Amino acid sequence: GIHLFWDSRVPVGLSRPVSEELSAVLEMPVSRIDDGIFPLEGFDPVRNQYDAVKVLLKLDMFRRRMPQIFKPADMDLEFYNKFNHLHEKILLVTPGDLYEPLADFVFGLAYPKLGVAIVSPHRLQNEFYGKYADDSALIDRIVKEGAHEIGHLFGLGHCDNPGCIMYCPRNLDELDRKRKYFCGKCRVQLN
């Protein structure tokens, strides 16, 4: 299953549309959790950013500890304990600004081996750039970078086609040029 864990500090009114467009572009059912925060880990005071690798490990631990949330009713509890990362993929939508060791920042990150991914609207929001709110733009961006990260969870790498969801954006302008679209090469792999 695919679970959108929407940190409620991100405007929860955007939750449902993001969930529905993620589901359409992935062509897969996506369940929405948007009634709670996910306190982040691995904060770096000099950077003023959070280590996304640590958050992702914490996310796996949370899933394993929370059968009552993520385990399908028809799934044995012991099977879930061993295999939750194969079956219940999670995308965390967090307000925190993210980095990884090799990068000044990231819009998101995936840990394919543990079936967990993360996207941060912190640099996707118009407001980060001193521009007025634009809910549709923010939905567009989260969907595109969210489907990207989730694609990784299914084994896809970065794509060369700049309009494809799997393309890796260097900046916000490149991200906005991506379309809600998996190219031919990527759809075959994703299937």
- 87 belongs to an annotated ligand binding site: no
At closest approach, how far in Å is the CB of 67 from Fe ion? Answer: 35
At closest approach, how far in Å is the CB of 188 from Fe ion? Answer: 10
What token pair was written down for 96? 């925190």
Could you tell me where the DSSP H helices lie in the chain?
15-26, 52-65, 67-70, 77-87, 135-153, 172-177, 184-190
Nearer to Fe ion, 10 or 166 (CB): 166
Binding region for Fe ion (CB under 5 A)? 159, 161, 164, 166, 183, 186
Nearer to Zn ion, 50 or 70 (CB): 50
* Cα separation, 96 vs 27, whole angstroms: 28
- Let me know if 149 is a catalytic residue: yes
* 164, interface contact from Zn ion, Fe ion, none, CB < 5-8 Å by kind: Fe ion
Binding region for Zn ion (CB under 5 A)? 168
CB contact at 8 A, 168 and 157: no
* Cα separation, 72 vs 111, whole angstroms: 22
Instruction: List binding-site positions for Zn(2+).
Output: 148, 152, 158
